[PDB]
Design a protein around this ligand. Structure first.
Ligand SMILES: Cc1cc2nc(N)[nH]c2cc1C
Length: 125
């Protein structure tokens, strides 16, 4: 997991952001943002950073098996416990399933709400 990763592919961005309830204008404007993910793993402990276009950054620190509060780009927050399941980090909350995985030097991040699955693939730098 440790590294720096640049977003290159994503599935179902529009559907997912609509389901979150953000405006089409913000969906359209935000579409062009570059996203760089920085991860440092130290045993069970993770430091997880997302760097957006125009200087903004969001860092989340968590331990596998321990409870924590994860935050988003916009500033929304939610309680969770990150689990290691078969090389994936897995998170759960009310009507929200999220996974992160390294697949051949690529960070693949899947998020599902209802029947809408969002995927992000990011290339290692
Ligand atoms: C803030 C934000 C901007 C994005 N732009 C694209 N393409 N995907 C995104 C995801 C998030 C969370």
């Amino acid at each position: 997991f440790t590294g720096k990763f640049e977003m290159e592919s994503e599935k179902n961005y529009d559907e997912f952001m609509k389901l979150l309830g953000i405006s089409s204008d913000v969906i359209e404007k935000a579409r062009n943002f570059k996203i760089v993910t920085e991860v440092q793993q130290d045993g069970q402990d993770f430091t997880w950073s997302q760097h957006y276009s125009g200087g903004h950054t969001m860092t989340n620190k968590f331990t596998v098996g321990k409870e924590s509060n994860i935050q988003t780009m916009g500033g929304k927050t939610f309680k969770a416990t990150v689990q290691m399941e078969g090389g994936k980090l897995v998170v759960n909350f009310p009507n929200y399933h999220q996974t992160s995985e390294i697949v051949g030097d690529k960070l693949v991040e899947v998020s599902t709400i209802g029947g809408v699955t969002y995927e992000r693939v990011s290339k290692r730098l």
